[PDB]
Coordinates of C-alpha atoms in Angstrom, one line a residue:
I1 CA 195.5 -80.2 221.6
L2 CA 193.8 -83.2 223.2
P3 CA 194.0 -86.6 221.4
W4 CA 190.7 -88.2 222.1
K5 CA 189.4 -88.9 225.6
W6 CA 187.7 -92.4 225.5
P7 CA 185.1 -93.9 227.8
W8 CA 186.8 -96.9 229.3
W9 CA 185.8 -97.0 233.0
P10 CA 187.6 -100.1 234.1
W11 CA 185.0 -100.9 236.8
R12 CA 186.9 -104.0 237.9
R13 CA 190.0 -102.5 239.7

């Protein structure tokens, strides 16, 4: 099953 999708949008590439 899925582990835990976390919101971490690294805006700065």
